[PDB]
Amino acid sequence: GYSDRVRSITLGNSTITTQECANVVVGYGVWPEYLKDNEATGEDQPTQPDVATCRFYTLESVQWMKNSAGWWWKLPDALSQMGLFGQNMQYHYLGRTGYTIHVQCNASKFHQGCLLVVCVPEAEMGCSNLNNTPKFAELSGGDNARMFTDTEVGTSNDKKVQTAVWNAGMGVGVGNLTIFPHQWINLRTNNSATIVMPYINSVPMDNMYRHNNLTLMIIPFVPLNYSEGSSPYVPITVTIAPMCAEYNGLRLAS
Amino acid sequence: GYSDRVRSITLGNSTITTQECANVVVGYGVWPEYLKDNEATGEDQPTQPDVATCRFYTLESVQWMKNSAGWWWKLPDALSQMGLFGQNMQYHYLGRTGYTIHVQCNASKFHQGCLLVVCVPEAEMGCSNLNNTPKFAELSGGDNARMFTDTEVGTSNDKKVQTAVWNAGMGVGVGNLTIFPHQWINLRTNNSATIVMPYINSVPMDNMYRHNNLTLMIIPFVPLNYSEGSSPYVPITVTIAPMCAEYNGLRLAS
Amino acid sequence: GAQVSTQKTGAIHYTNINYYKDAASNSANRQDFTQDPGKFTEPVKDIMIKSMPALN
Amino acid sequence: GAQVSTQKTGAIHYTNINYYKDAASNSANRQDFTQDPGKFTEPVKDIMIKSMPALN
Amino acid sequence: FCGSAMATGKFLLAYSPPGAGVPKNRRDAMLGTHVIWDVGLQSSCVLCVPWISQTHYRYV
Amino acid sequence: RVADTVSSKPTNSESIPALTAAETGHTSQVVPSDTMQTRHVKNYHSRSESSIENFLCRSACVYYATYNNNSEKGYAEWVINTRQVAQLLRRKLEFTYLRFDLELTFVITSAQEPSTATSVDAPVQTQQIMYVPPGGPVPTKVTDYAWQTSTNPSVFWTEGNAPPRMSIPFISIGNAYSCFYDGWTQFSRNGVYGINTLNNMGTLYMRHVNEAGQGPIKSTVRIYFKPKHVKAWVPRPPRLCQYEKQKNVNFNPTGVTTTRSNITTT
Amino acid sequence: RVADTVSSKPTNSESIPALTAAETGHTSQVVPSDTMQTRHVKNYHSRSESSIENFLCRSACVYYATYNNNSEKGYAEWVINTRQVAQLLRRKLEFTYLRFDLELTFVITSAQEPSTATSVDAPVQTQQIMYVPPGGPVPTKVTDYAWQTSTNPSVFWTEGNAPPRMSIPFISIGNAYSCFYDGWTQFSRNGVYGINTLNNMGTLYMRHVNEAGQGPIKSTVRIYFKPKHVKAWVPRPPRLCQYEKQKNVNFNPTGVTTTRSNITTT
Ligand SMILES: CCCCCCCCCCCCCCCC(=O)O
Ligand SMILES: CCCCCCCCCCCCCCCC(=O)O
Ligand SMILES: CCCCCCCCCCCCCC(=O)O
Ligand SMILES: CCCCCCCCCCCCCC(=O)O
Secondary structure (H helix, E strand, O other), X not given: OOOXXXXXXXXXXXXXXXXXXXXXXXXXXXXXXXXXXXXXXXXOOOOOOOOOOXXXXXXXXXXXXXXXXXXXXXXXXXXXXXXXXXXXXXXXOEEOXXXXXXXXXXXXXXXXXXXXXXXXXXXXXXXXXXXXOOOOOOOOOOOOOEEOEOOOOOOOOOOOEOOEHHHOOOOOOHHHOOOOOEEEOOOOOOOEEEXXXXXXOOOOOOOOOOOOOEEEEEEOOOOOEOOOOOOOOOEEEEEEOEEOOOEEOOOOOO | OOOOOOOOEEEOOEEEOOOOOOOEEEOOOOOOOOOOOOOOOOOOOOOOOOOOOOOOEEXXXXXXXXXXXXXXXXXXXXXXXXXXXXXXXXXXOEEOOXXXXXXXXXXXXXXXXXXXXXXXXXXXXXXXXXXXXOOOOOOOOOOOOEEOEOOOOOOOOOOOEOOEHHHOOOOEOHHHOOOOOEEEOOOOOOOEEEEEEOOOOOOOOOOOOOEOOEEEEEEOOOOOEOOOOOOOOOEEEEEEOEEOOOEEOOOOOO | OEOOEEOOOOOOEEOOXXXXXXXXXXXXXXXXXXXXXXXXXXXXXXXXXXXXXOOO | OEOOEEOOOOOOEEOOEXXXXXXXXXXXXXXXXXXXXXXXXXXXXXXXXXXXXXXX | OOOOOOOXXXXXXXXXXXXXXXXXXXXXXXXXXEXXXXXXXXXXXXXXXXXXXXXXXXXX | XOOOOOOOOOOXXXXXXXXXXXXXXXXXXXXXXXXXXXXXXXXXXXXXXOOHHHHHOOOEEOOOOEEEOOOOOOOEEEEOOOOXXXXXXXXXXXXXXXXXXXXXXXXXXXXXXXXXXXXOOOOOOEEEEEOOOOOOOOOOOOOOOHHHOOOOOEEEEEOOOOOOEEEEOOOOOOOOEEOOOOEOOOOOOOOOOOHHHHOOOOEEEEOOOOOOOOOOOXXXXXXXXXXXXXXXXXXXXXXXXXXXXOOXXXXXXXXXXXOOOOXXXX | XOOOOOOOOOOOOOOXXXXXXXOOOOXXXXXXXXXXXXXXOOOOOOOOOOOHHHHHOOOEEOOOOEEEOOOOOOOEEEEOOOOOOHHHXXXXXXXXXXXXXXXXXXXXXXXXXXXXXXXXXXXXXXEEEEOOOOOOOOOOOOOOOHHXXXXXXXXXXXXXXXXXXXXXXXXXXXXXXXXXXXXOOOOOOOOOOOHHHHOOOOEEEEOOOOOOOOOOOEEEOOEEEOOOOOOOEOOOOOOOOOOOOOOOOOOOOOOOOOOOOOOOOO
């Protein structure tokens, strides 16, 4: 072992290599594995698809402004339109997978900032109006980032999610969000963040279009900054890889 | 072994059981198998999909009239729109499969007729006009039967295939079409016809949209007939099952 | 490398040598006869003996 | 001096004799393949394994 | 990457076999074979185009 | 290899090797000694003149192209293919995938042309038949740079001796030649459909090496192929309609057989 | 040969065989199974058609010089060198120091010329191609004393048969041929600078042996070299600008590559 700060990951067809990174946080202490034949209840045979599904699908990018609050994604839904993971997701009826989340954000030695890369299992949300429940087009984007705000929510539109960043939108203390697995991105000494998450859920296999497994949240606790005479555009990107996929219950598409 | 004339076939999810049938003709003498690692040139890993692809997809039906000449289908193209065999056919780039052709046509003991169920490997065709070459919409139907005629072709439309049944359209003697594997359907003593075909082709794995492997031809050598006072509608159906499918070269759809 | 093989008699020997590097300079393999009819005639799955009736 | 050596097969033998005094009358040494890439690729002094990082 | 030592950034490198070429968007190219490279401290990264073809050879 | 025969006696059992079902796609296996009582005769014949090794390995004409000596464009060229003569085409279309070698042979000939000079004394002529694989240089005249042949294989032969002959390995891209192709060349499924989509095979050039004369001579080359080590797969029925295109299968429908004036007439 | 491949599984360690430094002048050694997960396929290919033994040992044209039969100065001569044709020159300039044998070959040809006599009947002609090393006698006409060839090697060949061929050892002064020379010939560092300072190699003479005729015939010889036992050292990049001088390296600067209408255009 020489020069700890360099990693390398070759999963299937893609490879992501960082030179300046921290350690790798591996789930709750387990590596994602297939489903044993002692805990299954499906009566069909599964379908370990290919290397063609365990790949590195990169999602959209965004700009880290100087007033931005935070973004998030829904994991089983963000990869709905990507390659052969989005075809075996809708043609079948069941499935279980694990992911390998990644994040890139690189700045010079004259910038500053921080971020909290964390994934929350079973993330709920709260509508703006108390009586109603949130919409769907205001809860999940089509692999495009959803963003928090500074003002709380207003009183509209009776279905919008409440983007109150200091409460996280779930109704908890934002400082206590370090229980779920995570990693910090400090531009002083960091350039990325890796996270390996297994499949955590009550039932053995669950639908993909009806119930979202996890939720990826990004929150900058310390805003960007820089003196005059430097690049004012700092973008962010994320790369995710389905790990150990399986399916059951073949039907027509939807 | 008791009462030879009864068979039963359970392939995947469907099951087809006939009570009055002849023997089963198995290809050129081989059973369809996977591709060994001594004759492969692909550098990726294959994808044995599931039981969800080796199933019994039933195609359209037609009426056996008293003047009809003959029908045909193109095998790798007829199953293009059926279930998860038509999704892994276009998302990938390579593949090799074998089929288990079946045919149903049942009449009473007061009807008569015959048919030649045969599959031809690498079936070519001849355009109507000599200079040009046939069209595509006149060579392959979208899982709907194409039919021969009695008059030869005419001189139109400079792209139509020549439907001369007594020459088969390929330019050979129709009586010599018993070299390729086959089975007869004589309504006197028969009710169906089964055929198992392996993968026969020069290269190991070939495209699915650019080159059609086989061709299924049905020709009644003795027309139907019946006295007054019987059902005048005798339909025909065919059931096909992809056997030992494999794929390579994942890309976007087309 | 010389082989002394047999000849084609109605009902003897004859020598032979190769002089080149490749394999496409030799002569044809005329003296080779191998037959197997089972592939084209009788491709059925169940084996049928000619004594027993065909279909039950 | 005759040698019975091998031939170039896709995946046998073939004789050969020399008839002259000099050495410039023989045929080319086509059936000889010897590879060593280390001279041109990787001429460095310290040996570098692909697992460890390049420069510290 | 031959920029200054205060520079930073990540990049994507995709090889899409031919069924439909020239991916217009980034999300169209991310489905094929790819890799993610980030600069700084041994910046040079190597993408390995594998060999994926039906036949055994090809024409120059 | 052929088989012998066996002596049969009268029988009255229920063996019935005659009646069978033909729906099962099974050719029968009845011999003459099963249906009637016969003698015992041991056959000494041999199935040797019919195997594919002996049936195909004979040379045949493929294409004869001529080239005059008059001008700077005397040379003549030909694109390789085997479906240009009717005799050797139909001897291939009883199978689907072949595999063989070849032994080329060129029977070159000459002839005079009218002229006005007083006397004529033509020394022997020489050729110079070249082979250009696909994707390579090309000559355009009889005094070009391409005729150096630094890597191309050429054959030089002076008139009056035996004709030139040589071998050729199994040069192809696939694991066997394909005589029938069902499908297009473009992935969009448009344009060219026939068999020539996977047939390039190179070219073939010929030329007079002599400077010039007073005739001047005219010549015609003749090619001859001889498949040496054959291997055939997937037989099919022979052809019944004449050939009418070089790279198609277009035909004109004809009767299946000539006609007799009755069903019972001999 | 070529090497096989090996089966790879998903990994999350810190191996990173991708990121490296290119400043060290070290080409990487990453195979496809290191960066992604692949199958196991054993390659059966062979790197045989690319070795220098098989790549160079083919004959090519070098120089064709003609000589008429009319007068007492019919004979023609040539000074040995290999940088007179573009095809074989550039096939040498990928290395620096070579070592090989040769197999010469002369494809001689003839042709008539206008005359006024009534009839013409030309018997076969003969040659008579001589080789004069550096520092030796020289002929000046077709009836000289030098044509005795008491120690010089000559070749006599009558028209109509196969062409003459012969071998040649590694005749040189140094331990290997030199295709590039950097430096002068005079110790004062003045005058000639290029590569011909260490190239003499002798001469080459040709001549008609027949007495005379009525045509009279004209002829053109063609040389053909074939390096037999090669050995190469110190490769270098190929050429990019055309040749324009026989004993220089002068060129005209051109673009590095043809152009496309964009950076992102396919
Ligand atoms: C002077 C030597 C020249 C040798 C020329 C080699 C000729 C190649 C022959 C190609 C095989 C014949 C065609 C088979 C299938 C087809 O393309 O129709
Ligand atoms: C009749 C026999 C005559 C033999 C003539 C021998 C010819 C010698 C060839 C010299 C080697 C070729 C030149 C290599 C390097 C150079 O000088 O450019
Ligand atoms: C170039 C061949 C010259 C003619 C052959 C003369 C006999 C030499 C001995 C050959 C023995 C080779 C071994 C064998 O018998 O196969
Ligand atoms: C001038 C050679 C004539 C042809 C050769 C005939 C065979 C004679 C025996 C040669 C044995 C030499 C030893 C060896 O095998 O290398």
